[PDB]
Structure 1
Amino acid sequence: KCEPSQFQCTNGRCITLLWKCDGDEDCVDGSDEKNCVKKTCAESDFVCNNGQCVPSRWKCDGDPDCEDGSDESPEQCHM
């Protein structure tokens, strides 16, 4: 029960539209972090197998920069 420029979750508390799946569960049930689309990654970054974007400078440097380690695999870097 608020302005259409405000958002209400399943508890009933009204929050602003800028808190829509921003990462913080503002209300109790946390339904604001549920239903939104995933943004696209940048072209200048390197895409991991799980989708964790890392800069292209960090590729093939001899140090793990990803959870899956696809930035240092021998398939993705010829050795």
Structure 2
Amino acid sequence: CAESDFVCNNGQCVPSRWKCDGDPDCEDGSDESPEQC
């Protein structure tokens, strides 16, 4: 992934925009965990 793109634990490149967005973009769903949002 590029230097400006966040990496999920599986290697998926997801923009920095899509944190706590409501959408399970990362396969493990760690970015969308309710406790950390």
Normalising by the residue count of structure 1, what TM-score does the alignment of the two structures yield? 0.39
Considering fraction of residues, name the structure with more helix: 2
Alignment coverage as a number of residue pairs: 37
Normalising by the residue count of structure 2, what TM-score does the alignment of the two structures yield? 0.66
- Structure 1 unmatched runs, 5+: 1-40
- Structure 2 unmatched runs, 5+: none
When the two chains are superposed, the root-mean-square deviation of aligned CA atoms in Å is: 1.8
Structure with higher RCO (Cα < 8 A, 6+ apart): 2
Kindly name which structure, 1 or 2, has the bigger radius of gyration based on alpha carbons. Answer: 1
Tell me the percent identity: 100
Considering fraction of residues, name the structure with more strand: 1
